[PDB]
Amino acid sequence: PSHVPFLLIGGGTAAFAAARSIRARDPGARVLIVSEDPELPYMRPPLSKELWFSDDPNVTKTLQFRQWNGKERSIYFQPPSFYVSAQDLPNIENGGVAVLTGKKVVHLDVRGNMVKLNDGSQITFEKCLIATGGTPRSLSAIDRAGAEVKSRTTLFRKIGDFRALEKISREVKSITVIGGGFLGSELACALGRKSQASGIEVIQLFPEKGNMGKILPQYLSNWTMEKVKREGVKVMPNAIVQSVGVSGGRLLIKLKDGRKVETDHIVTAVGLEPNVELAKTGGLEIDSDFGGFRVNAELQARSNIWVAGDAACFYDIKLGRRRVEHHDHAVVSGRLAGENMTGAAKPYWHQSMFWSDLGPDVGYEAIGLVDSSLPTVGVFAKATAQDNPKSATEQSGTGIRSESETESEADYGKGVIFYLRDKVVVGIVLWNVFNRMPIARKIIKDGEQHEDLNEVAKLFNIH
């Protein structure tokens, strides 16, 4: 038994953003975050990226990474002294953010306004937030298998997982990566580079005809496969796993089409499933279409319960009911999540943005609704020295691209791809086009039926 006014569940990108949001509005509010992880809230994007590109080993320790412009940066959101302890909190009377790492909420009670930690202790809340994110999908073929194979397989998302992998890559001869996602691909390049240094084999395999095939059009997905390949990666499309066994001391991957890949370690990056274990005890709605907790436009589930981030199935007027997995989204909705908690009764209006880096040399931004199967227009040109994340970082000063681009709304190598529906732009992927995301947002938000989409591209430096 004990009490805190602002309590937030899951200690991630969304929880920390709300934590900052509430503080801003109610200065002197007492905030407590509970987190499964033993780590203090940190951003995630460096884990599949810039953290792999440092030649300093004690950076596997400190997690102080280098950007493409080469300036240090801590992974954790703020230094730890910024927090206040969890016991000292009620007596701080001036408020702060306290962090209960190593604990887990296992019972919610909406009428009773209290959670239950795994160790059985209880905490009463006045205002609660569920920002639990998600657990990466396993691959049912790996589930039927023994604990021996299960062990030789990681599911990349945490820091525990970043260190574990990077460790293995200095140990074995061949790491296979399952998943044609951005993560998958980022990973595969991250490994691909290290490979150019140890000789290790990096295989990437996935059911799609190409990298990010479910998103990008064939011709750009295909181009992307080449870059993955060039970074030293034996890449295997149209791959569908049948079984994973152990023979010759190694891991054997059998494919539905007969092929057989033999390897040392599997890292699987094939989706996220949203953490909704709390919904059963408390009794909130989940979405069977999109997954995760059903909230309204004010990201609200029931009185004194808001949800945000990757677990957030929210309504969005200029689009409809949704659930997205952006970092940008987690920052914003979290913020909004804390804004609403302190009686701000406000809608969600942001257009969340995604981004991916494959190395310092190639970057994709995306926003809106992007699917390969929708009608597509893409305009393309030869890229200039600026058209890559290295420059975009040297300029803006940051590596987290949703920062460089703000959340406002104003021989080929770069271009923009419009995703249409009825001569009207509904999604956008930008390839190596930087600091033009507000123009991306504007176009989508307006919704005009351009009888020529070239002109629209003249807006991204494309001539």
**Cα–Cα nearest to 367, from 248, 215, 200, 256:** 215
> Smallest distance from the beta carbon of 235 to ligand FAD, in angstroms?
20
> Smallest distance from the beta carbon of 33 to ligand FAD, in angstroms?
9
Among 5, 11, 179, 415, binds ligand FAD (CB under 6 A): 11
Helix count and strand count (H, E) for the chain: 13, 27
Known binding residue 435? Answer is yes
Dihedral angle, C-alpha 175, 178, 183, 186, nearest 10 °: 40
Distance CA 368, CA 354 (A): 9
Distance CA 9, CA 123 (A): 12
List all residues 6 or more positions away from 33 whose beta carbon is below 8 Å from its beta carbon. 7, 8, 11, 15, 16, 19, 41, 97, 98, 99, 100
Answer yes or no whether residue 50 interacts with ligand FAD by CB under 6 A: no
Answer yes or no whether residue 325 interacts with ligand FAD by CB under 6 A: yes
Q: Token pair of 364, please?
A: 């994709």
Stretch that binds ligand FAD, among 3-11, 211-219, 232-240, 407-415 (CB under 6 A): 3-11
- Taking CB under 6 A as the rule, which mask of x and - marks residues 132-171 in contact with ligand FAD? xxx----------------------x--------------
Known binding residue 310? Answer is yes
Taking CB under 6 A as the criterion, which residues in 356-415 touch ligand FAD? 356
Stretch that binds ligand FAD, among 31-39, 172-180, 241-249, 281-289 (CB under 6 A): 31-39
Helix residue spans in 279-326 (DSSP H): 279-282
Known binding residue 282? Answer is no
Stretch that binds ligand FAD, among 56-64, 201-209, 325-333, 443-451 (CB under 6 A): 325-333
- Taking CB under 6 A as the rule, which mask of x and - marks residues 180-209 in contact with ligand FAD? ---x--------------------------
Tokens 């609660």, located at residue:
128
Known binding residue 384? Answer is no
# residues near ligand FAD by CB under 6 A:
35
**Is-contact 331 424, C-beta < 8 A?**
no
> Smallest distance from the beta carbon of 39 to ligand FAD, in angstroms?
8
Helix residue spans in 66-217 (DSSP H): 140-144, 147-151, 159-169, 182-198
Known binding residue 181? Answer is yes
> Smallest distance from the beta carbon of 402 to ligand FAD, in angstroms?
6
134-136 and 272-274 strand pairing: antiparallel
C-beta closer to ligand FAD: residue 30 or 44: 44
Which letter does DSSP use for residue 405 in this model? T
**DSSP letter string over 242-278?**
EEEEEETTEEEEEETTS-EEEESEEEE---EEE--TT
**Cα–Cα nearest to 21, from 460, 316, 333:** 333
Answer yes or no whether residue 109 interacts with ligand FAD by CB under 6 A: no
Among 8, 13, 293, 457, binds ligand FAD (CB under 6 A): 13
Known binding residue 51? Answer is no
**Is-contact 7 127, C-beta < 8 A?**
yes
C-beta closer to ligand FAD: residue 176 or 185: 185
**Which residues are 305's β-sheet partners?**
128, 302
> Smallest distance from the beta carbon of 248 to ligand FAD, in angstroms?
31
C-beta closer to ligand FAD: residue 387 or 405: 405
**Cα–Cα nearest to 443, from 460, 456, 429:** 456
Specify binding-site residues: 10-14, 36-37, 44, 49, 68, 105, 157, 180-183, 208, 214, 271, 310, 325-327, 355, 365, 435
Q: Which residues bind ligand FAD (CB under 6 A)?
A: 9-14, 34-37, 44-45, 47-48, 104-105, 131-134, 157, 183, 275, 277-278, 309-310, 325-328, 330, 354-356
Annotated binding site for NAD(+): 68, 180-183, 208, 214, 271, 325-326, 355, 365, 435
